[PDB]
């Protein structure tokens, strides 16, 4: 599992988007789109803005 940190709150604005709160840790599913990254939290899989998350690499 690759992980991302929510840097800012994000409210879903379309059907395939996921809501997150600042500080949330999410599983990264796909980062090939420059603008939107696919993530996973709980039973949800969808997109958040790439600029709102940071990859958690040492």
């Amino acid at each position: 599992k690759e992980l991302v940190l929510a840097l800012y709150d994000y409210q879903e604005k379309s059907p395939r988007e996921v809501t997150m709160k600042k500080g949330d840790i999410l599983t990264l599913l796909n980062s090939t789109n420059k603008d939107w990254w696919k993530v996973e939290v709980n039973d949800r899989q969808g997109f958040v803005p790439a600029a709102y998350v940071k990859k958690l690499d040492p």
Partner: peptide
């Protein structure tokens, strides 16, 4: 916060 995308 940053801008959303389009």
């Amino acid at each position: 916060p940053p801008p959303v995308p389009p």
